[PDB]
Amino acid sequence: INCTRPNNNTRKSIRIGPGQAFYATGDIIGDIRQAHCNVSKATWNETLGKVVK
Amino acid sequence: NITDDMRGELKNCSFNMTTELRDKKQKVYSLFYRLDVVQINSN
Amino acid sequence: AENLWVTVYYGVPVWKDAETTLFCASDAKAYETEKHNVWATHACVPTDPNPQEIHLENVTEEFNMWKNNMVEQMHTDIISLWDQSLKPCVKLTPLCVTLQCTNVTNNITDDMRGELKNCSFNMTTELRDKKQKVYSLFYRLDVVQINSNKEYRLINCNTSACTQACPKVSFEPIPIHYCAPAGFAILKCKDKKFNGTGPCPSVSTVQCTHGIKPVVSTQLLLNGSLAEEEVMIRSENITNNAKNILVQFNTPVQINCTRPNNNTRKSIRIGPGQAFYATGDIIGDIRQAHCNVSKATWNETLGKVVKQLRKHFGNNTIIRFANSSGGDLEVTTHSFNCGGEFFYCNTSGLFNSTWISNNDSITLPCRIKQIINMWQRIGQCMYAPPIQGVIRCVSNITGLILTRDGGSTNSTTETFRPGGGDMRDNWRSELYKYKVVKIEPLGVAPTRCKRRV
Amino acid sequence: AVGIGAVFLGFLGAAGSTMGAASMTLTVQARNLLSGLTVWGIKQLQARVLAVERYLRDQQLLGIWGCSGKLICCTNVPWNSSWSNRNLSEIWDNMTWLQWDKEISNYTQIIYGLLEESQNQQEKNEQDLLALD
Numbered sequence: 250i251n252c253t254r255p256n257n258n259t260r261k262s263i264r265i266g267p268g269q270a271f272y273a274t275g276d277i278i279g280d281i282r283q284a285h286c287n288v289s290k291a292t293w294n295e296t297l298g299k300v301v302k
Numbered sequence: 303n304i305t306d307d308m309r310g311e312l313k314n315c316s317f318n319m320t321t322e323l324r325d326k327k328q329k330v331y332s333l334f335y336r337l338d339v340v341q342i343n344s345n
Numbered sequence: 346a347e348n349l350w351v352t353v354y355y356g357v358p359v360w361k362d363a364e365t366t367l368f369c370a371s372d373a374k375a376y377e378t379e380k381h382n383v384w385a386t387h388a389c390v391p392t393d394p395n396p397q398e399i400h401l402e403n404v405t406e407e408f409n410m411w412k413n414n415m416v417e418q419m420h421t422d423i424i425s426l427w428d429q430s431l432k433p434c435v436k437l438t439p440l441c442v443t444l445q446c447t448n449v450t451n452n453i454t455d456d457m458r459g460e461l462k463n464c465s466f467n468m469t470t471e472l473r474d475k476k477q478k479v480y481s482l483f484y485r486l487d488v489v490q491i492n493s494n495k496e497y498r499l500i501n502c503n504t505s506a507c508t509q510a511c512p513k514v515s516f517e518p519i520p521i522h523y524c525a526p527a528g529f530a531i532l533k534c535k536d537k538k539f540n541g542t543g544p545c546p547s548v549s550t551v552q553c554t555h556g557i558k559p560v561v562s563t564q565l566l567l568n569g570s571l572a573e574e575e576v577m578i579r580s581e582n583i584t585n586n587a588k589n590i591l592v593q594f595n596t597p598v599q600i601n602c603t604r605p606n607n608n609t610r611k612s613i614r615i616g617p618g619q620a621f622y623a624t625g626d627i628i629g630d631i632r633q634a635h636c637n638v639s640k641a642t643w644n645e646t647l648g649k650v651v652k653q654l655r656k657h658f659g660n661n662t663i664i665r666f667a668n669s670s671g672g673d674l675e676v677t678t679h680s681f682n683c684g685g686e687f688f689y690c691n692t693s694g695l696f697n698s699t700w701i702s703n704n705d706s707i708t709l710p711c712r713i714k715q716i717i718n719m720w721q722r723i724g725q726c727m728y729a730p731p732i733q734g735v736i737r738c739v740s741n742i743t744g745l746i747l748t749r750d751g752g753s754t755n756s757t758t759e760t761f762r763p764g765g766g767d768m769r770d771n772w773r774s775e776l777y778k779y780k781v782v783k784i785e786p787l788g789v790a791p792t793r794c795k796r797r798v
Numbered sequence: 799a800v801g802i803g804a805v806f807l808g809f810l811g812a813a814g815s816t817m818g819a820a821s822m823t824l825t826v827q828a829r830n831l832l833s834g835l836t837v838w839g840i841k842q843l844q845a846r847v848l849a850v851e852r853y854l855r856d857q858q859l860l861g862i863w864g865c866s867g868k869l870i871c872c873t874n875v876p877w878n879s880s881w882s883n884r885n886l887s888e889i890w891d892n893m894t895w896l897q898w899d900k901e902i903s904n905y906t907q908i909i910y911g912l913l914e915e916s917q918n919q920q921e922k923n924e925q926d927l928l929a930l931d
């Protein structure tokens with residue numbers, strides 16, 4: 250199974266107190282797309298067949 | 303620059319935050335996913 | 346005598362090197378109240394009034410002063426005790442606030458110009474609704490300008506929040522004895538000319554070490570132990586200039602230090618059951634703090650040190666002393682704690698001389714601080730409350746820590762400068778004659794005795 | 799009584815003496831092997847536990863060799879000259895236990911197994927003999 254988050258994220262540091270930081274999300278460098286996962290259809294079908302048997 | 307499936311899944315929020323000094327405050331902004339925020343009752 | 350058989354003996358005197366956990370043991374007299382001490386001897390087992398030591402004849406043992414685990418254990422224990430003593434004390438979070446400071450010019454000498462500031466700020470009260478306006482005196486080493494009566498802030502506001510030291514606890518060092526568990530032992534080297542490494546021909550065994558006072562300082566070892574015969578120079582590798590040199594004196598050298606200011610203390614309530622001890626006005630004149638040593642005594646001691654140093658560099662070499670090179674204030678100055686306050690003296694008049702192959706006093710100006718970073722850590726500071734009245738203390742100089750400059754070829758000149766920093770070298774100057782061993786009371790040997798069936 | 803008439807006695811007192819002389823003071827070392835949430839909270843407990851474990855581990859070995867409750871125990875395993883060919887006079891009158899340990903440190907594990915198997919055989923034979931009656 251292959252999974253990915255296809256967004257180039259940017260991090261920010263915000264000082265909210267003495268020696269304390271909160272890490273925020275800045276802007277996204279590029280396009281915005283959904284995250285997903287991939288599996289092979291044939292392999293999954295074979296495994297499901299064995300499970301059913 | 304978003305697709306049709308990522309519509310409304312991200313929000314651009316701004317808020318007042320405390321500083322290292324107890325007297326003054328700062329105005330900041332950050333991006334939050336729509337699954338982490340709740341409306342309370344444009345922008 | 347050829348029909349020899351194995352025979353088993355239990356309780357033979359043999360041992361091996363080992364690393365284990367030692368435990369403290371304080372004196373009984375420390376239990377007479379005085380529970381207010383950073384070194385929590387409340388949990389330390391009482392010591393034996395009559396310690397026992399056994400002499401080991403004909404035994405020769407190998408010591409290595411620079412690979413001793415006792416030093417690491419002592420360092421960790423000291424740090425842990427220091428941290429533990431500060432947990433039930435006030436946390437000065439609300440003190441990180443904009444200040445409005447101005448110079449203190451009121452009956453001051455020409456050397457104390459710009460060293461004190463008079464600051465005022467808004468502070469929280471016991472009630473969550475209202476606030477109060479207060480003022481206090483801060484040393485110039487604790488404030489930073491941010492961009493008349495310009496505005497400042499405490500130096501530590503952008504790294505962490507300081508913890509105020511509880512005013513009842515005392516910093517006075519107390520002797521401590523380290524003891525080994527059952528099945529282990531501590532060996533001691535009784536040789537008077539031991540140089541910290543190699544075989545010691547005179548040995549003995551004890552169960553606890555002598556009382557060791559945890560004195561914290563740099564460039565100078567105070568209230569320590571003295572050598573019996575001559576000044577001792579010890580180093581891991583004398584020919585390498587990246588290794589420090591430890592010097593143990595033959596006789597003590599007295600040093601007098603004082604803070605000649607009559608200080609006043611104020612109590613400010615910053616919350617429910619919480620107080621911040623500020624500094625009020627100074628009752629009288631304002632003058633710098635300093636320390637005194639005798640010129641003749643220092644000259645004699647330096648002469649002896651030079652005489653003992655030429656044995657590793659030849660009789661026709663020039664030896665000269667220079668002050669520290671550079672770094673932070675905690676490394677280029679002789680730091681120490683004198684009855685609550687923390688000093689940083691300028692030991693530049695001591696190491697100023699050159700020696701050929703052939704009444705008065707020295708005054709060392711000193712500064713003071715209130716935000717302390719111990720153990721060379723980052724992110725943990727401490728605030729020292731002010732002390733009321735004048736301060737004076739006396740102690741002995743027992744040793745030194747030096748460093749050599751890498752010179753080209755043999756220029757016939759060697760320059761040594763003071764240098765401290767790591768506090769493990771302070772412990773190493775006391776635990777240099779001890780080591781821990783593990784007993785193995787099982788042995789087999791041949792004999793003519795045979796078991797009866 | 800005057801006992802053995804020694805100048806003084808103490809823990810590890812005879813470390814630098816010949817193995818013959820050091821063998822008369824085994825009790826001195828034997829009796830000192832058992833007792834002789836703050837920072838100092840567990841530094842006192844773990845040490846005690848470790849001491850107890852070491853003592854029991856040492857006792858078990860004597861137990862399985864048939865030498866329980868003894869300070870000097872004779873065995874039935876002959877000495878092998880490969881371990882050491884030195885005389886019986888230059889061992890008990892010209893060497894110390896510290897030196898001896900170094901010489902035979904390699905063959906210690908070899909000797910231990912023979913002592914176990916000999917005791918096993920002895921116990922089996924004794925059981926058979928008693929069964930015969």
Ligand SMILES: *[C@@H]1O[C@H](CO)[C@@H](O[C@@H]2O[C@H](CO)[C@@H](O[C@@H]3O[C@H](CO[C@H]4O[C@H](CO)[C@@H](O)[C@H](O)[C@@H]4O)[C@@H](O)[C@H](O[C@H]4O[C@H](CO)[C@@H](O)[C@H](O)[C@@H]4O[C@H]4O[C@H](CO)[C@@H](O)[C@H](O)[C@@H]4O)[C@@H]3O)[C@H](O)[C@H]2NC(C)=O)[C@H](O)[C@H]1NC(C)=O
Pocket residue numbers: 514515516517518560567568681682683684685733737738739740741
């Ligand atoms: C190397 O070794 C030397 C000697 O061991 C050491 O110097 C000694 O330092 C200690 C610690 O500062 C000194 O002990 C203090 O002494 C002062 C001065 O009092 C002296 O004179 C009176 C009258 O003659 C004697 O009775 C007394 O014994 C002293 O000789 C005392 O004022 C100190 O007591 C105060 O501090 C204690 C610890 O904090 C408190 O427990 C005690 O209750 C006192 O505080 C209370 O009273 C204060 C004054 O009213 C008040 O301000 C407080 O808020 C609180 O209410 C303490 O006993 C000792 O005298 C030094 N010895 C010499 C010979 O000078 C060096 O410091 C050491 N070197 C290093 C680097 O550590």
Ligand SMILES: *[C@@H]1O[C@H](CO)[C@@H](O[C@@H]2O[C@H](CO)[C@@H](O[C@@H]3O[C@H](CO)[C@@H](O)[C@H](O)[C@@H]3O)[C@H](O)[C@H]2NC(C)=O)[C@H](O)[C@H]1NC(C)=O
Pocket residue numbers: 316317318329
């Ligand atoms: C962060 O803090 C700032 C400053 O405290 C907040 O801004 C303030 O928001 C209030 C809410 O509306 C403003 O009051 C209104 O002002 C308008 C314009 O003057 C007036 O017509 C209304 O009747 C009402 O009084 C206030 O003026 C404003 N202050 C400033 C300096 O802009 C802000 O809302 C806080 N939150 C965020 C996310 O920034």
Ligand SMILES: *[C@@H]1O[C@H](CO)[C@@H](O[C@@H]2O[C@H](CO)[C@@H](O[C@@H]3O[C@H](CO)[C@@H](O)[C@H](O)[C@@H]3O)[C@H](O)[C@H]2NC(C)=O)[C@H](O)[C@H]1NC(C)=O
Pocket residue numbers: 444445465466467478
């Ligand atoms: C402690 O808190 C007090 C009260 O909050 C602070 O005083 C306030 O300081 C501000 C900063 O200048 C003042 O605003 C200015 O007022 C002047 C005079 O009215 C005006 O001309 C300026 O345009 C500006 O608005 C404010 O008036 C003042 N409030 C009071 C009641 O005096 C103070 O600065 C805080 N810090 C310290 C160290 O006291």
Ligand SMILES: *[C@@H]1O[C@H](CO)[C@@H](O[C@@H]2O[C@H](CO)[C@@H](O)[C@H](O)[C@H]2NC(C)=O)[C@H](O)[C@H]1NC(C)=O
Pocket residue numbers: 257278
């Ligand atoms: C995600 O964005 C960062 C920042 O824009 C990219 O990092 C830069 O990549 C460029 C490539 O042209 C380099 O020249 C820069 O030195 C990189 N660091 C910067 C700009 O700070 C990163 O390559 C992007 N990752 C992608 C697109 O997969």
Ligand SMILES: *[C@@H]1O[C@H](CO)[C@@H](O[C@@H]2O[C@H](CO)[C@@H](O)[C@H](O)[C@H]2NC(C)=O)[C@H](O)[C@H]1NC(C)=O
Pocket residue numbers: 251252253285286287
């Ligand atoms: C997972 O599968 C998807 C398709 O099911 C892959 O998406 C393709 O990605 C390539 C490279 O970016 C594009 O050229 C194709 O157009 C994409 N297919 C589409 C849009 O249908 C994806 O690369 C696979 N890998 C991962 C990690 O998800």
Ligand SMILES: *[C@@H]1O[C@H](CO)[C@@H](O[C@@H]2O[C@H](CO)[C@@H](O)[C@H](O)[C@H]2NC(C)=O)[C@H](O)[C@H]1NC(C)=O
Pocket residue numbers: 250251287288289
């Ligand atoms: C999941 O990702 C892996 C990458 O490690 C893919 O394995 C590669 O598949 C390509 C097919 O286009 C081969 O050419 C590569 O040799 C493979 N790499 C390795 C290391 O074996 C895998 O195919 C992906 N699976 C799915 C279902 O997308």
Ligand SMILES: *[C@@H]1O[C@H](CO)[C@@H](O[C@@H]2O[C@H](CO)[C@@H](O)[C@H](O)[C@H]2NC(C)=O)[C@H](O)[C@H]1NC(C)=O
Pocket residue numbers: 310344
């Ligand atoms: C911004 O996004 C919101 C959704 O987060 C849009 O508002 C509607 O919200 C409801 C409730 O979740 C959804 O069912 C609708 O699909 C959303 N869209 C519409 C058109 O009703 C809102 O329209 C978006 N745009 C603005 C300007 O707020």
Ligand SMILES: *[C@@H]1O[C@H](CO)[C@@H](O[C@@H]2O[C@H](CO)[C@@H](O)[C@H](O)[C@H]2NC(C)=O)[C@H](O)[C@H]1NC(C)=O
Pocket residue numbers: 276277314315316331
């Ligand atoms: C989220 O909103 C912030 C503003 O609240 C955006 O940041 C500003 O964008 C404008 C428009 O280009 C710039 O002129 C400003 O300099 C930006 N910074 C500030 C502090 O205003 C930010 O781009 C928004 N993010 C997204 C993803 O829309």
Ligand SMILES: *[C@@H]1O[C@H](CO)[C@@H](O[C@@H]2O[C@H](CO)[C@@H](O)[C@H](O)[C@H]2NC(C)=O)[C@H](O)[C@H]1NC(C)=O
Pocket residue numbers: 448459493
């Ligand atoms: C108050 O003290 C400050 C110093 O804390 C004086 O300002 C100067 O500060 C610089 C930077 O450290 C020094 O090099 C100067 O020697 C200081 N003095 C002068 C005259 O420049 C300041 O002058 C003092 N007086 C006032 C009224 O602020």
Ligand SMILES: *[C@@H]1O[C@H](CO)[C@@H](O[C@@H]2O[C@H](CO)[C@@H](O)[C@H](O)[C@H]2NC(C)=O)[C@H](O)[C@H]1NC(C)=O
Pocket residue numbers: 449450451463464465480626627
């Ligand atoms: C530090 O400044 C404060 C004021 O902020 C001084 O205290 C005031 O001094 C004036 C002048 O004598 C008096 O009239 C006031 O009664 C004092 N108290 C207050 C609350 O204003 C203080 O003297 C200054 N300290 C130094 C050393 O200069």
Ligand SMILES: *[C@@H]1O[C@H](CO)[C@@H](O[C@@H]2O[C@H](CO)[C@@H](O)[C@H](O)[C@H]2NC(C)=O)[C@H](O)[C@H]1NC(C)=O
Pocket residue numbers: 540541542543544578579580581582583
């Ligand atoms: C401390 O004395 C020991 C000897 O007791 C020194 O170690 C010997 O140093 C010489 C050369 O100086 C070597 O040849 C020997 O092999 C060393 N012996 C051992 C056992 O290490 C040691 O150098 C001396 N250290 C100082 C700083 O004087």
Ligand SMILES: *[C@@H]1O[C@H](CO)[C@@H](O[C@@H]2O[C@H](CO)[C@@H](O)[C@H](O)[C@H]2NC(C)=O)[C@H](O)[C@H]1NC(C)=O
Pocket residue numbers: 582583584585586
């Ligand atoms: C003690 O220090 C000296 C000097 O640093 C070491 O001698 C050097 O050894 C290196 C080998 O790593 C050589 O490259 C240098 O030429 C040597 N310098 C001199 C002046 O001899 C010496 O090895 C160190 N002692 C130990 C035990 O490491």
Ligand SMILES: *[C@@H]1O[C@H](CO)[C@@H](O[C@@H]2O[C@H](CO)[C@@H](O)[C@H](O)[C@H]2NC(C)=O)[C@H](O)[C@H]1NC(C)=O
Pocket residue numbers: 607628734735
């Ligand atoms: C430091 O100042 C305090 C307070 O002024 C002095 O303590 C007072 O000394 C006088 C002496 O005339 C006594 O009458 C008072 O009873 C003392 N307590 C007070 C005023 O609260 C102290 O003597 C000064 N110390 C010096 C100058 O060394």
Ligand SMILES: *[C@@H]1O[C@H](CO)[C@@H](O[C@@H]2O[C@H](CO)[C@@H](O)[C@H](O)[C@H]2NC(C)=O)[C@H](O)[C@H]1NC(C)=O
Pocket residue numbers: 601602603635636637706707708
């Ligand atoms: C340390 O030495 C200094 C001088 O080097 C001493 O200062 C003298 O103190 C007395 C008494 O207050 C004055 O009469 C002298 O005028 C001072 N000498 C000067 C100003 O040169 C000091 O007393 C000594 N003691 C301490 C503890 O520092």
Ligand SMILES: *[C@@H]1O[C@H](CO)[C@@H](O[C@@H]2O[C@H](CO)[C@@H](O)[C@H](O)[C@H]2NC(C)=O)[C@H](O)[C@H]1NC(C)=O
Pocket residue numbers: 599600601637638639706739
């Ligand atoms: C450091 O202070 C001590 C105070 O205890 C000084 O010792 C005194 O010195 C004077 C000399 O004027 C003698 O009259 C006293 O008898 C000494 N007192 C004691 C208890 O011995 C010492 O001289 C000072 N040393 C320096 C270098 O200033």
Ligand SMILES: *[C@@H]1O[C@H](CO)[C@@H](O[C@@H]2O[C@H](CO)[C@@H](O)[C@H](O)[C@H]2NC(C)=O)[C@H](O)[C@H]1NC(C)=O
Pocket residue numbers: 691693694
């Ligand atoms: C430590 O003290 C020495 C000597 O007092 C300081 O060096 C002197 O600094 C002054 C200026 O403050 C110069 O006028 C002198 O010329 C310097 N001495 C010499 C021999 O040149 C030294 O700066 C002090 N250390 C500090 C301040 O960190």
